[PDB]
Amino acid sequence: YTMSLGAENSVAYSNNSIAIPTNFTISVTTEILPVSMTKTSVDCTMYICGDSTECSNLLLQYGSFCTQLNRALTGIAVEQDKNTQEVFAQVKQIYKTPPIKDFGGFNFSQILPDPSKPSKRSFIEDLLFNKVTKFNGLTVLPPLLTDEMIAQYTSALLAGTITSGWTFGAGAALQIPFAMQMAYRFNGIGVTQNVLYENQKLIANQFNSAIGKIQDSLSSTA
Amino acid sequence: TRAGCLIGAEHVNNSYECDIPIGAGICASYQQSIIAYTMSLGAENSVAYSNNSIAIPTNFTISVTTEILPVSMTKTSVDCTMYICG
Amino acid sequence: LTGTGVLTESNKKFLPFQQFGRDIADTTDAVRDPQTLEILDITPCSFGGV
Amino acid sequence: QIDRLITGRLQSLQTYVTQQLIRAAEIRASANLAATKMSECVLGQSKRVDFCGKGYHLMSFPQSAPHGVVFLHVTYVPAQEKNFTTAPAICHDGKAHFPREGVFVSNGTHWFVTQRNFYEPQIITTDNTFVSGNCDVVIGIVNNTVYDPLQPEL
Amino acid sequence: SALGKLQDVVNQNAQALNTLVKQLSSNFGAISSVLNDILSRLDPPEAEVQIDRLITGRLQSLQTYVTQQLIRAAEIRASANLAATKMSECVLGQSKRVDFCGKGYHLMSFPQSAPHGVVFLHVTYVPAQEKNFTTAPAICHDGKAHFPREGVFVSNGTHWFVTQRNFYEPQIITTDNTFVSGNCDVVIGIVNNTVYDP
Ligand SMILES: *[C@@H]1O[C@H](CO)[C@@H](O[C@@H]2O[C@H](CO)[C@@H](O)[C@H](O)[C@H]2NC(C)=O)[C@H](O)[C@H]1NC(C)=O
Ligand SMILES: *[C@@H]1O[C@H](CO)[C@@H](O[C@@H]2O[C@H](CO)[C@@H](O)[C@H](O)[C@H]2NC(C)=O)[C@H](O)[C@H]1NC(C)=O
Numbered sequence A: 001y002t003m004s005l006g007a008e009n010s011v012a013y014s015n016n017s018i019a020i021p022t023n024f025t026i027s028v029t030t031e032i033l034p035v036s037m038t039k040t041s042v043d044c045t046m047y048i049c050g051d052s053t054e055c056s057n058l059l060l061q062y063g064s065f066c067t068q069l070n071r072a073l074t075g076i077a078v079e080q081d082k083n084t085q086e087v088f089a090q091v092k093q094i095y096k097t098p099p100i101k102d103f104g105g106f107n108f109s110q111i112l113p114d115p116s117k118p119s120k121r122s123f124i125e126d127l128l129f130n131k132v133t134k135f136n137g138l139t140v141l142p143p144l145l146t147d148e149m150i151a152q153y154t155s156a157l158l159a160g161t162i163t164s165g166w167t168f169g170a171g172a173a174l175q176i177p178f179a180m181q182m183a184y185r186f187n188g189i190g191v192t193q194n195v196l197y198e199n200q201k202l203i204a205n206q207f208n209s210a211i212g213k214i215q216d217s218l219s220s221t222a
Numbered sequence B: 001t002r003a004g005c006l007i008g009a010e011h012v013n014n015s016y017e018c019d020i021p022i023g024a025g026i027c028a029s030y031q032q033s034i035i036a037y038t039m040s041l042g043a044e045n046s047v048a049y050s051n052n053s054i055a056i057p058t059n060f061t062i063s064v065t066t067e068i069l070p071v072s073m074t075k076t077s078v079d080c081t082m083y084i085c086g
Numbered sequence C: 001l002t003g004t005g006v007l008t009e010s011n012k013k014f015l016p017f018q019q020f021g022r023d024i025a026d027t028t029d030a031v032r033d034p035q036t037l038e039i040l041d042i043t044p045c046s047f048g049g050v
Numbered sequence D: 001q002i003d004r005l006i007t008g009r010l011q012s013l014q015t016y017v018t019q020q021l022i023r024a025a026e027i028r029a030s031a032n033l034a035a036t037k038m039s040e041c042v043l044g045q046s047k048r049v050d051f052c053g054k055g056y057h058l059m060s061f062p063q064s065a066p067h068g069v070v071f072l073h074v075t076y077v078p079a080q081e082k083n084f085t086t087a088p089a090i091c092h093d094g095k096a097h098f099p100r101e102g103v104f105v106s107n108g109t110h111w112f113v114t115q116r117n118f119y120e121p122q123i124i125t126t127d128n129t130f131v132s133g134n135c136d137v138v139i140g141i142v143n144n145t146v147y148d149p150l151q152p153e154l
Numbered sequence E: 001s002a003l004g005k006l007q008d009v010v011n012q013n014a015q016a017l018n019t020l021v022k023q024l025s026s027n028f029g030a031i032s033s034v035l036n037d038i039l040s041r042l043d044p045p046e047a048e049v050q051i052d053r054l055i056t057g058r059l060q061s062l063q064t065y066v067t068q069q070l071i072r073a074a075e076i077r078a079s080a081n082l083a084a085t086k087m088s089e090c091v092l093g094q095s096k097r098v099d100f101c102g103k104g105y106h107l108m109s110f111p112q113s114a115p116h117g118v119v120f121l122h123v124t125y126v127p128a129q130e131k132n133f134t135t136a137p138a139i140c141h142d143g144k145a146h147f148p149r150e151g152v153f154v155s156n157g158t159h160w161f162v163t164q165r166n167f168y169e170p171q172i173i174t175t176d177n178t179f180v181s182g183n184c185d186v187v188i189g190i191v192n193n194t195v196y197d198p
């Protein structure tokens, strides 16, 4: 068939008609972005020649191709650790959430770490790590940051934003009650606080349910 | 280590900022002798969070930092006939 | 079958007609010795960067 | 025969390195975008449309992935919307009374100043409107009373 | 090492060129890298084969150089596009993007020409000599649930003020700096206090 681009929608436009929202959803969506790939290394001599001295006596007339090839792969491997540092090591001081998690009805249990410890990871991070799955001179170099360190960086970014809003990004982490942080964020989108405070339980039930649908979507869809 | 066998460095329980990256969270430093350790991501900071407490700045700094960005590389030309055949 | 490596005693269960076992990407990673029929596991000799 | 083997294997290794360099640059652009999203979606609230989720970005949560990062974008998605009659400005004593922050909306009979993203009517007052010019200029002038808060007290 | 990034580019160029030159002294499986030697001590039917081997090796070296130059040029182009974006949004304006024009709240950036690139001097407002206060989402006066217009309700041990969020400047609660919405039943952390009527 000829594909459909969508459903035609003639907007009810007039020179004196407006549509105003009387409600809201509070939506949580996920974005997945690769940050690094495997740090691989090749011994060009052992790949091309292996253990043969005869081939090793040759391949010297070919020049510095081997020194040029493993220099490029080394630059790639060094860049992968630089990629992870730029993404995750964006935080000074490893922030921790308080033992009393009173965030105005908002429930971050599935994104905060659990001490049951499939590493110091969250419930969502445990779902993520299960969902996605040396010879001839080929070696794989471990990343400088372990998965436990990245999850520690991630939990510090998460603890800072829950407790201190955007202040920790600029300077020192300044504590602010949650749902007072959320009232600031409604002001950023043109909603006049107030709508948050008068709908604080609805805005929370909508947030917690939307977070719950992520763990279902991650567990269900391959 | 997970990166391999390290000979000539002494492992310590202490954790510091990474100085010479070895891998798998292991870094090396010079104190007298060369030490190998698990790198520290930073200083733990439990922010004094409450449902009715706020922190307000009473002053400021005015910081000036520098960011260096490459914009161009050397414009080179190779006469392939001259290079290959002279 | 000529090669280099370390020959551990293996628990691979070869069928009687077979004489050696290959892996993915076709690398000989097991073999049964002609005398005293028994499967051996080949692992490459230790190597790396320094 | 060794030179033929060397030439083929060397070409195979050059091919591998070239495609790794091209893929590494592709990953680096992804890592730079992920580092920009951490700064602008997690460490702040972004005004850029569709940069941090679909809707009006409120706040994002990073989650660690084996070779990447997962952002949990929390956005304010409006709509249980309704329709209303609208005027650019309101004429009262010939002063044109534009709204300070919201929009003029109308029921079948009455007019209000609601905020543009949430419906919250509020009556027309001098506190939430400002006066500029007379009523001859603006095309969509609509007559209405503008309530002076001070006058009832006096 | 402050300008290391710029230095890197220079090195990454020079080394490459060096390799290219040092690929002119490789036999590539021929009798010599000096082509005049091959012509001098060989009959052209065999010198042709030797010249062909040298040609293949040198051509492969030059193709490798050109490919790596194209990849590095794409990297430099991405860097230059980022630098142009920073010139537009940090120097020609004030950016609200976090950490795009330095760490802190961006005030203004200054360009400086660097020998083979650009340097941005980002002046940002870094807050903090901070203090701790008690906050309320709203203030309850006459049962009307007042909210701050532009700042935040903060408390000393005894009194309440409306301060701006990034600098401490108390100011007493008034009808001019608050707006009324609803009654006092809904807001969870609402606190009793008087709001001053000018
Ligand atoms: C705005 O939408 C929410 C749904 O997100 C409405 O809340 C629901 O209301 C129905 C009955 O009115 C209940 O059965 C649901 O349990 C509610 N959902 C939640 C998450 O609380 C809300 O009523 C709407 N408000 C307006 C003014 O339309
Ligand atoms: C936040 O949500 C989690 C799960 O979504 C809640 O954890 C449950 O807590 C109850 C009792 O507190 C236990 O019986 C369950 O076993 C827990 N897990 C699940 C999957 O239900 C947690 O209680 C919520 N937080 C708050 C404050 O309600």
Ligand SMILES: *[C@@H]1O[C@H](CO)[C@@H](O[C@@H]2O[C@H](CO)[C@@H](O)[C@H](O)[C@H]2NC(C)=O)[C@H](O)[C@H]1NC(C)=O
Binding pocket: C034, C035, C036, C037
């Ligand atoms: C080859 O023949 C020799 C000599 O008999 C075998 O060695 C002995 O074989 C008997 C019978 O199988 C065993 O009971 C002994 O234990 C074996 N001795 C040793 C030292 O192994 C040998 O197994 C035969 N190899 C074959 C058939 O592959």
Ligand SMILES: *[C@@H]1O[C@H](CO)[C@@H](O[C@@H]2O[C@H](CO)[C@@H](O)[C@H](O)[C@H]2NC(C)=O)[C@H](O)[C@H]1NC(C)=O
Binding pocket: D107, D108, D109, D110
């Ligand atoms: C538009 O809004 C006005 C003001 O809210 C509505 O007029 C009010 O209607 C209610 C009906 O319950 C009465 O109790 C009030 O006394 C009315 N206020 C007046 C007359 O000043 C009007 O009905 C609305 N129009 C609609 C919904 O079509």
Ligand SMILES: *[C@@H]1O[C@H](CO)[C@@H](O[C@@H]2O[C@H](CO)[C@@H](O)[C@H](O)[C@H]2NC(C)=O)[C@H](O)[C@H]1NC(C)=O
Binding pocket: A015, A016, D139, D140
């Ligand atoms: C908005 O559009 C309507 C629709 O055309 C305009 O209404 C016309 O107004 C002229 C003169 O005012 C009349 O002659 C027409 O008969 C009207 N047409 C209809 C269909 O009503 C109106 O003028 C426009 N501008 C406004 C409302 O400010």
Ligand SMILES: *[C@@H]1O[C@H](CO)[C@@H](O[C@@H]2O[C@H](CO)[C@@H](O)[C@H](O)[C@H]2NC(C)=O)[C@H](O)[C@H]1NC(C)=O
Binding pocket: D091, D141, D142, D143
């Ligand atoms: C406002 O209502 C009046 C009549 O009810 C109209 O405006 C009048 O226009 C005439 C002709 O220019 C003037 O002489 C009157 O002084 C005006 N009266 C006012 C401004 O109150 C007109 O129908 C309405 N204005 C609109 C719809 O924009």
Ligand SMILES: *[C@@H]1O[C@H](CO)[C@@H](O[C@@H]2O[C@H](CO)[C@@H](O)[C@H](O)[C@H]2NC(C)=O)[C@H](O)[C@H]1NC(C)=O
Binding pocket: E156, E157, E158, E159
């Ligand atoms: C918090 O600030 C208020 C106001 O700055 C302080 O109240 C003042 O207390 C002195 C002591 O007698 C009075 O003279 C002032 O008139 C008060 N100011 C008023 C009423 O506006 C209060 O003491 C401070 N609390 C602290 C520092 O804990």
Ligand SMILES: *[C@@H]1O[C@H](CO)[C@@H](O[C@@H]2O[C@H](CO)[C@@H](O)[C@H](O)[C@H]2NC(C)=O)[C@H](O)[C@H]1NC(C)=O
Binding pocket: A102, B051, B052, E188, E189, E190
């Ligand atoms: C903010 O948190 C405090 C501490 O958890 C809450 O104080 C509790 O309030 C309930 C009922 O008001 C009491 O039964 C508890 O004994 C209190 N706990 C403590 C430790 O004092 C408070 O309710 C929360 N909300 C506010 C202040 O609006």
Ligand SMILES: *[C@@H]1O[C@H](CO)[C@@H](O[C@@H]2O[C@H](CO)[C@@H](O)[C@H](O)[C@H]2NC(C)=O)[C@H](O)[C@H]1NC(C)=O
Binding pocket: E140, E184, E190, E191, E192
């Ligand atoms: C404000 O103070 C009063 C008592 O000093 C309390 O609120 C009272 O609550 C009762 C029961 O609902 C009502 O009958 C009174 O009219 C209320 N008085 C008011 C609102 O002034 C309560 O301790 C305080 N309110 C808070 C902390 O929200």
Ligand SMILES: *[C@@H]1O[C@H](CO)[C@@H](O)[C@H](O)[C@H]1NC(C)=O
Binding pocket: B013
């Ligand atoms: C600390 O170092 C000492 C001596 O190096 C060692 O015996 C001990 O196991 C280490 N760890 C702890 C927890 O003490």
Ligand SMILES: *[C@@H]1O[C@H](CO)[C@@H](O)[C@H](O)[C@H]1NC(C)=O
Binding pocket: A012, A013, A014, A017, A019, D081, D082, D083, D084
């Ligand atoms: C109300 O606005 C227009 C008025 O012409 C109407 O046709 C349309 O169906 C309605 N739109 C909404 C959002 O209900």
Ligand SMILES: *[C@@H]1O[C@H](CO)[C@@H](O)[C@H](O)[C@H]1NC(C)=O
Binding pocket: A017, D083, D084, D085, D106, D107, D108
């Ligand atoms: C909204 O649109 C409907 C359908 O066109 C119409 O009947 C109604 O009057 C409109 N209301 C307003 C106030 O625009």
Ligand SMILES: *[C@@H]1O[C@H](CO)[C@@H](O)[C@H](O)[C@H]1NC(C)=O
Binding pocket: A174, A175, B048, B053, B055, E130, E131, E132, E133
């Ligand atoms: C004030 O609040 C807490 C209360 O325990 C205190 O520990 C903290 O140091 C103070 N906050 C700041 C950032 O000054």
Ligand SMILES: *[C@@H]1O[C@H](CO)[C@@H](O)[C@H](O)[C@H]1NC(C)=O
Binding pocket: B053, E132, E133, E134, E155, E156, E157
């Ligand atoms: C700030 O923290 C200090 C030290 O923990 C505490 O004594 C004080 O009561 C706190 N003040 C406020 C208003 O939160």
